[PDB]
Amino acid sequence: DKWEMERTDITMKHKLGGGQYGEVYVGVWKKYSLTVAVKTLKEVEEFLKEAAVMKEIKHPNLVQLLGVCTLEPPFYIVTEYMPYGNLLDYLRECSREEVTAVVLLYMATQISSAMEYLEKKNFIHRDLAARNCLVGENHVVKVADFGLSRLMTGDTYTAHAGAKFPIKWTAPESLAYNTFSIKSDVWAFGVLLWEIATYGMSPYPGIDLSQVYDLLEKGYRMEQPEGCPPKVYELMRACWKWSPADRPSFAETHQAFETMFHDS
């Protein structure tokens, strides 16, 4: 676009995460001594859809695009580099004396502020999870993995038939009828919050995948994690209302966390 770069501006240092689809590297942009992350693929417009969505989004809590290389293979997307990796591994491995309750709360305020931004732009993410969040210094958390993100035309996006999703993060109307909406991102946010409050447990632990929809339909929701405040649990419960209209908006979610945050 106007976001092209010459391949030779960047030195690929080491690999961070390979794919069945494609791989991820850390590199240096010589011309500024800046560390960047570089995503790539081989044997286009899918990989590119992610590029196109990140062009349009500019919020301090969404991993920022720095450029692209998309006239010749290998094709590159380049972004700022998050030094402490994905949020899930960060939670599982941190010092709990260093990440307190108040840090966990801060992390959630950041995420709700990125989604507040994206809801107003009418983008859906479609893969909210703690594995798809990235961490930086000072406990900056940034939302990432935008490869299923889409600008919606109205209020619902329907994915193709035959399309399979991570069950424990996906809203029931999405599992039943394949319908995504901002409200289905709300649900996954809920599930993300519980991953945070538990320092990185797996959702529905010890429940067969095959039973989740049904359990849900008959009323079951995950329980309050140990140490999690009532109001944060009630918020996380509102995210899981069976009816998408009944769930909160990301404005409201953001409002509730900023408020809790300032009151500590």
Ligand X SMILES: Cc1nc(Nc2ncc(C(=O)Nc3c(C)cccc3Cl)s2)cc(N2CCN(CCO)CC2)n1
Side chain identity at residue 24, one-letter code: V
82 binds, among ligand X, Zn ion, none (CB under 5 to 8 A by kind): ligand X
Adjacent-strand bridge partners of 4: 68
| Residue 114 lies near ligand X (rule: CB under 6 A) | no
Q: Is 17 in the site for ligand X (CB under 6 A)?
A: yes
Burial class (CB within 10 angstroms; exposed 0-12, middle 13-18, buried 19+) of 68 = buried
Nearer to ligand X, 3 or 220 (CB): 3
253: phi then psi, degrees, rounded to nearest 5: -55, -45
x/- site string to Zn ion, residues 245 to 264, per CB under 5 A?
---------x----------
Active site residue 127: yes
Sole binder of ligand X in the list 16, 94, 175, 238 (CB under 6 A): 16
Q: Considering 1, 127, 145, 214, which one is annotated as catalytic?
A: 127
39 is in an annotated binding site: yes
Of 23 and 252, the one with the shorter C-beta distance to ligand X is: 23
What is residue 152's DSSP assignment? Answer: -
- Contacts of the segment 175-181: beta carbons below 8 A, 24+ positions apart: 175/213, 176/213, 180/124, 180/126, 180/156, 181/124, 181/152, 181/155, 181/156, 181/157, 181/244
- The helix-helix angle for 182-197 and 230-239 (nearest 10°) equals 150
Residue nearest to Zn ion (CB): 254
Please enumerate, by residue number, every residue annotated as part of a binding site for ATP.
39
Return residues touching ligand X (CB under 6 A): 16-17, 24, 37-39, 50, 63, 77, 79, 81-85, 134, 144-146
Return the active site residues. Answer: 127
Binding positions? 39
Site of interaction with Zn ion (CB under 5 A): 254
